[PDB]
From Swiss-Prot:
Residues 1-14 are annotated as: Disordered. Residues 1-11 have a biased composition (Basic residues). This is Histone H2A type 1-B/E. It is found in: Nucleus; Chromosome. The chain holds residues 9 to 66 of 130 of the full protein. It is involved in the initiation of both imprinted and random X inactivation. Ubiquitinated H2A is enriched in inactive X chromosome chromatin. Ubiquitination of H2A functions downstream of methylation of 'Lys-27' of histone H3 (H3K27me). H2AK119Ub by RNF2/RING2 can also be induced by ultraviolet and may be involved in DNA repair. It is present at 35S ribosomal DNA locus and impairs binding of the FACT complex. The nucleosome is a histone octamer containing two molecules each of H2A, H2B, H3 and H4 assembled in one H3-H4 heterotetramer and two H2A-H2B heterodimers. The octamer wraps approximately 147 bp of DNA. Core component of nucleosome. Nucleosomes wrap and compact DNA into chromatin, limiting DNA accessibility to the cellular machineries which require DNA as a template. Histones thereby play a central role in transcription regulation, DNA repair, DNA replication and chromosomal stability. DNA accessibility is regulated via a complex set of post-translational modifications of histones, also called histone code, and nucleosome remodeling. The modification N6-succinyllysine is found at K2.
Length: 58
DNA sequence: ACATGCACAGGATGTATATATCTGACACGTGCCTGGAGACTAGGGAGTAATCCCCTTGGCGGTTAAAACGCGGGGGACAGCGCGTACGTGCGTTTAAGCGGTGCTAGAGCTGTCTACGACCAATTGAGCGGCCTCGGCA
C-alpha cells in the first residue's frame, strides 16, 4: 500500500496556526533532549502563538 | 576532640577491539557582493564669540543616628515521632526508527499597485499695545 494523501497536521488537529511538526523537528534536531513528547510541541507552539497574538495585537 | 583523612572491598567503571559509514576537510568550480575610488552633491558639522544661568561653594541651622547603656524575651542548643524521600521492582506505555507519500509552505520570482513616505497650507495658542475704568492719593 501507500501512506495517506492530505493527512491532517498536528497544528490543525490542535486548532493551532504555528507548525507543531516543525516544533517537534527543532526540539529533536536542536539536541535539547534525546527523546521528546508528542504533546510537548503542541503546548510550546500554543505558547509561542499566544505570545505572538498578544504582542502583535498591542 | 573534632573535621578531615587513612586503606579495604565491591562492583562497576573506564577501557580496547571490533563492525560499519557519514561527517567533515579538501580541490575545484563558482560568481557573488564586497572592497574600492572617484565624480557629484549640499546637508551637516567645526570652530569662534556672546552671555545667560546653572552647579558649586561656604554657610546657618536644626535635628537627626550614633553612641552609651539596661531589661526580659526569644534565639540557640538536644531528644523524640513520624513522614516523607530514594530506590527496588516489574509492568507497559511511550517515543524512535525504517524510508516512502506527497502538501504546502519556500526562495525567489514577477505582479500591480498603493500605504505611507515626503512636502505644502491652513488651523489653534502665545506676549505686547491701547483706552477705558477705578482706587489710592497728594495739597
Amino acid at each position: 500500500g501507500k501512506a495517506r494523501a492530505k493527512a491532517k497536521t498536528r497544528s490543525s488537529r490542535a486548532g493551532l496556526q504555528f507548525p507543531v511538526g516543525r516544533v517537534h523537528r527543532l526540539l529533536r534536531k536542536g539536541n535539547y533532549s534525546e527523546r521528546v513528547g508528542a504533546g510537548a510541541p503542541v503546548y510550546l507552539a500554543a505558547v509561542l502563538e499566544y505570545l505572538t497574538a498578544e504582542i502583535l495585537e498591542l
